[PDB]
Amino acid sequence: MADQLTEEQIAEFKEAFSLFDKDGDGTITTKELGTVMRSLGQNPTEAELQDMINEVDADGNGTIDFPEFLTMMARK
């Protein structure tokens, strides 16, 4: 019906995570990360990304989730 800050807000962020998540599986790997970058005009190696993914992923699953990525947004 409408939107709203707080939790509701996140609902929106969902889409954000999608941008990066080109798998729609619910996770953001490296490639998927080195993809959207094309929009910004970037394209780091699988090494850098890994570090970037290991900058939010405190679980060390190797990939990035929605809640693990949400933090990335909070940053900047």
Nearest distance in Å: CB 5, Ce ion: 26
Q: Is 51 annotated as a binding residue?
A: no
Q: Is 54 annotated as a binding residue?
A: no
Nearest distance in Å: CB 46, Ce ion: 15
Per-residue CA distances from 9 to 12, 19, 71 (Å): 5, 17, 14
Q: Per the structure block, which two tokens stand in for 36?
A: 């959207």
Q: Is 65 annotated as a binding residue?
A: no
Tell which residue, 25, 15, 19, 14, has the closest CA to residue 63: 25
Annotated binding site, which residues? 21, 23, 25, 27, 32, 57, 59, 61, 63, 68
Annotated binding site for Ca(2+), which residues? 21, 23, 25, 27, 32, 57, 59, 61, 63, 68
